Amino acid sequence: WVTPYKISVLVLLSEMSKNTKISLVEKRRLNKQILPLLQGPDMTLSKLIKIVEECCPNVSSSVHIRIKLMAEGELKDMEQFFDDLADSFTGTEPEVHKTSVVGLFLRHMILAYNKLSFSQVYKLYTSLQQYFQSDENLYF
């Protein structure tokens, strides 16, 4: 269930909460605008970045480069993203994201990730590298 697109959405959610150039009110508005990405089907990294560029022009590049560094890194870099993301909510603001669409998405992604199989985690990281590579290969 956890795919490179879903990881990219987690990266987007993380980058949105960290954005130093918009207010907390604007962040709350943007989290509402982003909801169809959490509920919709998987899309290429190229399409996701194009969507993010339209509503969050700042974070689009930050999202793109974060995936780039994870893909150009090692398996540990994907595992470290999941660890840091799990410690980043309901214990930083500290706002309860439990009944929320974002909260349920963060929960269901971290749970499905942890109920791994080392084989499945390794195949997830390679899938992520190919997902990023597919965007990097584009002429445009």
Residue numbers in the entry: 29 to 168
Paper text:
The anaphase-promoting complex/cyclosome (APC/C) is a large multimeric cullin-RING E3 ubiquitin ligase that functions to regulate cell cycle transitions by ubiquitinating specific cell cycle regulatory proteins and targeting them for proteolysis by the ubiquitin-proteasome system. Seeking to obtain insights into these structures at atomic resolution and to assist in the interpretation of cryo-EM reconstructions of the APC/C complex, we determined the crystal structures of full-length Apc4 and the N-terminal domain of Apc5 (Apc5N).
We purified residues 1–161 of X. laevis Apc5 as a bi-product of the Apc4–Apc5N coexpression system and crystallized the protein. The structure was determined to 2.2 Å resolution using single-wavelength anomalous diffraction phasing. Apc5N [residues 27–161 (human Apc5 numbering)] adopts an all α-helical domain architecture comprising seven α-helices. Helices α1–α6 pack to create an antiparallel bundle with α1 at the center of the domain almost completely surrounded by helices α2–α6. This α-helical domain is capped by α7, orientated orthogonally to the α-helical domain. In the crystal structure, residues 164–168 from the TEV cleavage site continue the α7 helix, similar in structure to α7 of human Apc5N defined in the EM density map. Residues 1–26 of Apc5N, predicted to form two α-helices, are disordered in both the crystal structure and the EM density map. A small shift of the loop connecting α5 with α6 accommodates the Apc4–Apc5 interface within the context of the APC/C. A larger 6-Å-conformational change involving the loop connecting α1 with α2 and the N-terminus of α2 results from both packing at the Apc4–Apc5 interface and a two-residue insertion within human Apc5 relative to X. laevis Apc5. DALI searches revealed weak structural similarity to the RNP assembly factor, although the biological significance of this similarity is unclear.
